[PDB]
Structure 1
Amino acid sequence: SMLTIVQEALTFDDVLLLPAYSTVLPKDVSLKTRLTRGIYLNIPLVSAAMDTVTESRMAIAMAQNGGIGILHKNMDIAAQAAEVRRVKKFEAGKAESYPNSCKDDLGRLRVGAAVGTGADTPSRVEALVEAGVDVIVVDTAHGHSAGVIERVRWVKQNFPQVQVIGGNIATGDAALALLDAGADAVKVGIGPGSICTTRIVAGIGMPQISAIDSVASALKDQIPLIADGGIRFSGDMAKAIGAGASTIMVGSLLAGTEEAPGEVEFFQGRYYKAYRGMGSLGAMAKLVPEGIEGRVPYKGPMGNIVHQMMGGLRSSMGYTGSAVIEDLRQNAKFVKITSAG
């Protein structure tokens, strides 16, 4: 009676995309999309800014495949800036054809970098911009805050030559606040991550399909949104884009690949790599932890998993008659399914 229930909110498993009349085969769909209003990608995939997912080796591979990597901020300003320079200066071998590379106007691979909102941020942003970073990601657990909103405005006013992303958010109200602060895109996801315990610790969250819809509906395509967290299968990517996302950010799916940070580890015969939330105890070494720490099976070169995922999205776009990403964003139709489905 006094309980304010805004909606019944939906996650990936609550919905299915409907097939529609199609004259496009999966092999012919275009996966080109925009990361921000100023940066386009050749595939809608972004690697998570996590110290077990994205350092320079992953970022290079992501850009070589047409996506982009967000360097995590769990490292010194000098280290993060060197990581940026490694990507911007990377030169492919003489027998290395990457025709879908995501590059800036100077022919250099694109890369992003995460920053916080604390006292070190101005120096960190300056160093990253000096090194040639393409986009600054003001990246916190709660983007709908004075700290994030004002830091986004500060990056936009002081470094207009770089693109800036703000997050994480889960509501249209948060999206409009970041839009008015000057963000070139927003990152959506409070609660969906595979290693998230925010739902348990804080009781806070927004099922990701309804989060994407709420943000996309408010933005009216003024800036794109990145759907961050909860992607377990390629089918989740198609659902996210059909719900309004322009790109997808993944951590678990890229953890354990050769290019992800960390050494492979022998354990019970099998090979593993570490994967941990940035709000886990180890990552933070004050707030109680909001992420778990675990192992993911060794996956080999990231290009394999990326090919599998993009192949699944191509199949979905064939089913929906979507020749280009914007077709899926605009024309997707869903059904809600029950627990039995």
Structure 2
Amino acid sequence: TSYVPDDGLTAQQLFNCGDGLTYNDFLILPGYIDFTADQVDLTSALTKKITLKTPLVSSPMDTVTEAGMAIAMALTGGIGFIHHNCTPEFQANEVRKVKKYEQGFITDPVVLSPKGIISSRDIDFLEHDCFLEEIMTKREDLVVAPAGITLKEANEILQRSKKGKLPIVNEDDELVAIIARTLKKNRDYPLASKDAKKQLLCGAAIGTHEDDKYRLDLLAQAGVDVVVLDSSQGNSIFQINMIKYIKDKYPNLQVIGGNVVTAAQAKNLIDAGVDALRVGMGSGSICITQEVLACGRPQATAVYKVSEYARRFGVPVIADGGIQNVGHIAKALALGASTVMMGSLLAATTEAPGEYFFSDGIRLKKYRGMGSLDAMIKVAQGVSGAVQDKGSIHKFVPYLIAGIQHSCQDIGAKSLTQVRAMMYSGELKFEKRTSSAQVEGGVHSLHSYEKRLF
């Protein structure tokens, strides 16, 4: 015979009925492998105009994305969104801080007012004399460098002054930047996500309330590339206006639509004029909306449903919420999502806001939902907590990339663009997983065991 039938379920019959299943409810039948995993191209679109080397994106939460994270993320190939739980000024600062970050050049030099350099030497010896400028008269005659400044002469010249951060200025003695030694052989970031001006990409979230139009402005000034509207149910006249307002004012600016879960919700945003859709309502580890409200939708189905529609307009979808492991990323992407947003899966990370604090013989790192009472009487829709400890976004992300690539390989696709083309064509196959199938899917029948991922 040499036939072999067409066993396997198609996306349609699996996510277009009314059962409402999530990532852990299904699998993806393998295909034919004839290329190595690293040959898999993960290039994907974040918006109608922007494209990242990797589909990963950090969430706009006060415990996940902040300068450091938006930078690492961008450097590793993804992008980040600065949360909006702080006066517009500060949030806007985190943007410019990112938007004008340059290899080797000092991050954002801590500084003080006279109220010249100031090397520890002084601070030590010789009562706290009348202010700093006094206890520190660092003569104009000092080791500084001209605008011809470069990483080359920098470090080297630093040897003469045996210092590790010589200052640089344009012409009007107003520090443009300070080169720094601290790393000893900077790596190369070939996938770095940057804009036209070669600066790293940077996103930012804002509300849809009136007092957010000013906030947006400060961000816009700072060179923000894309902004996402923060809402649990983004299909409101408020967001729609907020959309129009922004698109009009700033034509040259991408706007991602508030969190939606239905094709109907999307229609309004795609019409308002959005550049993408953030799909996901009540899937976040810290989000507890479905339990305290009554509205929401199972992630896997939501991502599939909203993408199949959004695609018909060239509007990328960001699968936000529900990604509890590498696996769930490939899943979300295979269902129509162009990129995926993470929060908890990127909390412990060292680039994330906050500091670690061992608790009960185990590592730790704060992490809560922006809808929690702390982050914010108001009805709490989120919870507060903390997670373990992962490596650094510079090594963690690369691991995610390998997984996603290994996933694509097992399936038979050499790119994410293909994975989607396959599932929409009916070539990509799926299969439901019973509770026992889920149990067998993970670790079982062991007396004890540990786990290390990369």
Q: TM-score w.r.t. structure 2 length?
A: 0.72
Match 2:95 to one of 84, 89, 97: 84
Q: Distance in 1 between matches of 2:223 and 2:263?
A: 32
Secondary structure at 1:269 match in 2: coil
Secondary structure of 1:143's counterpart equals coil
Scaled by the length of structure 1, the TM-score of the pair is: 0.96
The letter of the residue matching 1:21 is Y
Asked if the contact 2:326–2:400 (Cα under 8 Å) also holds between the matched residues in 1, the reply is yes
- Residue 275 (1) aligns with residue 367 (2): yes
Partner of 1:338: 434
Letter in 2 for 1:10: L
The answer for unaligned runs of 5 or more in structure 2 is 1-15, 105-150, 152-185, 438-454
Indicate the residue corresponding to 2:418 in structure 1. Answer: 327
- Which has the larger displacement, 153-162 or 303-312? 303-312
Shift of 1:221: 5.0
Q: 2:370, 2:382 within 8 Å by CA — same for their partners in 1? A: yes
Match of 2:395 in 1: 304
Opposite residue 82 of structure 1, the aligned amino acid is: N
Q: Which residue of 2 aligns with 1:241?
A: 333
Root-mean-square deviation (Å): 1.4
Count residues with an aligned counterpart: 336
Partner secondary structure for residue 78 of structure 1? helix
The residue type paired with residue 248 of structure 1 is V
Give the aligned residue type for 1:337: R
Matched-pair contact (CA < 8 Å) for 1:194–1:229: yes
Q: Deviations over 1:274-298 (max 9, x none)?
A: 00011111111x4311111111112
8 Å CA contact retained: 1:195, 1:276: yes
Report the Cα offset of residue 331 of structure 1. Answer: 0.8
Rg comparison, structure with higher value: 2
Offset of 1:264 from its aligned partner? 1.0
Counterpart CA distance in 1 for 2:344 and 2:396 is 11
Sequence identity (%):
45
Q: How does 1:1-341 map to 2 (within 5 A)?
A: 7-93=18-104, 95-219=186-310, 220=312, 222-284=314-376, 286-332=377-423, 333=428, 334-341=430-437
Deviation for aligned residue 1:304: 2.4
Q: Which moved more, 1:100-109 or 1:143-152?
A: 143-152
One-letter amino acid of the counterpart of residue 105, structure 1: A
Please state which structure has a larger fraction of its residues in strand.
1
Contact 1:149-1:181 within 8 A present in 2 as well: yes
Is contact 1:24-1:322 (8 Å) kept?
no
How far residue 61 of structure 1 moved from its aligned partner, in angstroms, is: 0.2
SS in structure 2 of the partner of residue 114 of structure 1: strand
- Report how far residue 203 of structure 1 moved: 2.5
* Segments ≥4 residues shifted beyond 4 Å: none
Q: Distance in 2 between matches of 1:330 and 1:247?
A: 15
Unaligned runs of 5+ in 1: none
Equivalent AA in structure 1 for residue 230 of structure 2: D
Q: Is the 8 A contact 2:230 2:258 kept in 1?
A: yes
Shift of 1:327: 0.5
Q: Is the 8 A contact 1:173 1:218 kept in 2?
A: no
